[PDB]
Amino acid sequence: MLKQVEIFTDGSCLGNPGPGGYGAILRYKQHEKTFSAGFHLTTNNRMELMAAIVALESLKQPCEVILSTDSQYVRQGITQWIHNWKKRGWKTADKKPVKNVDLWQRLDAAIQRHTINWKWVKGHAGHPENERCDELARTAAESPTLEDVGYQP
């Protein structure tokens, strides 16, 4: 692809666990799309992941993608754990499913589809789209419309 899809994502909750939401912005060929939804009861980690998942799932055909997020959880999973989670059949040694397996498997399916370059950002200052996503995540959390069916403590 001569030109790559740019994605920016964030998610958060109002207290953790609590109502939560995500925001994602995609830009390709100078066309921008936004996604945002709120959940009645969820976690920060689940919303940070959901933001990336929904953005990537919106690209139905394989794309070369640059995805910018300040999520530590997403970075940790992508850079440290997900190779091994998959190899272990998505279970820990006690044979329990890994935490947030539902969302990590959806992210893994998106990683199979797309050629993603991850940009782990720090701070909103040089990152206007990420700041917009932070606001979207909050306003969604202030007006949820979905149950997070995979949130299962």
Numbering used by the authors: 1 to 153
Sentences from the paper on this structure:
RNH is a nonspecific endonuclease that degrades RNA within RNA:DNA hybrids. In this study, we traced the evolutionary and mechanistic origins of the thermodynamic differences between mesophilic and thermophilic ribonuclease H1 (RNH) proteins. We then reconstructed ancestral proteins along the evolutionary lineages that connect ecRNH and ttRNH. We observed that, while Tm changed smoothly over both lineages, the mechanism of stabilization followed a more tortuous path.
The other resurrected sequences are evolutionary intermediates at successive phylogenetic nodes along the lineage from Anc1 to ecRNH (AncA through AncD) and from Anc1 to ttRNH (Anc2 and Anc3). Our first goal was to verify that the reconstructed ancestral proteins behaved like members of the RNH family by characterizing their structural and functional properties. Using far-UV CD, we found that all ancestors are folded at 25°C and exhibit secondary structure consistent with extant RNHs. We determined the crystal structure of one representative ancestor, AncC, at 1.3 Å resolution and found that it adopts the canonical RNH fold, superimposing with the ecRNH structure with average Cα RMSD of 0.8 Å and with the ttRNH structure with an average Cα RMSD of 1.3 Å. Finally, we assayed the reconstructed ancestral proteins for their ability to degrade RNA:DNA hybrids using a simple hyperchromic assay to follow RNA cleavage and nucleotide release: all ancestors were active at 25°C, demonstrating that they are all functional ribonucleases H. The temperature-induced unfolding of ancestors along the mesophilic lineage becomes irreversible starting with AncB and continuing through AncC, AncD, and ecRNH. For these proteins, the unfolding curve does not reflect a strictly equilibrium process, so the midpoint of the unfolding curve is therefore only an apparent Tm. AncC and AncD have nearly identical thermostabilities, with Tms ∼7°C lower than Anc1 because of unfavorable changes in ΔHs (−4.4°C) and Ts (−4.3°C) and a favorable change in ΔCp (+1.2°C).
